[PDB]
Amino acid sequence: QLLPLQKAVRGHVLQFEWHQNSLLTNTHPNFLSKIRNINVQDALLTNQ
């Protein structure tokens, strides 16, 4: 008669720990690859 209870709380803690193994492998956002070109500042900085 207790079994479903243990199953339930088991699922609780299971989903909980499983949540840890989630590190946005799910998605693949852009990571601000801003520098399309290196701007003027880069070149003139090199020279300077």
């Binding site: 008669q1 207790l2 079994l3 209870l5 243990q6 709380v9």
Partner: protein
Amino acid sequence: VKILEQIDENWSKEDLQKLLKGIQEFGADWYKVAKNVGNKSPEQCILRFLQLPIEDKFLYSTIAFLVGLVNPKTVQSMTQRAI
């Protein structure tokens, strides 16, 4: 058939006896049940209780290794069912 639960070590028979007795008519109040047993940490009770088999239901396959999903069935997939 004839499922025995007097099967644990490092906890006496009466240990789990009092454990289940509490959780029976105490509704998962881990503090109560810990009080209601002989000097085991509440989390200890939770863990042990969590490792309590029901060794008479899981039967040893295609379904025995897959659930909420399955190979389709219009072709000769039963080849799988004879794995």
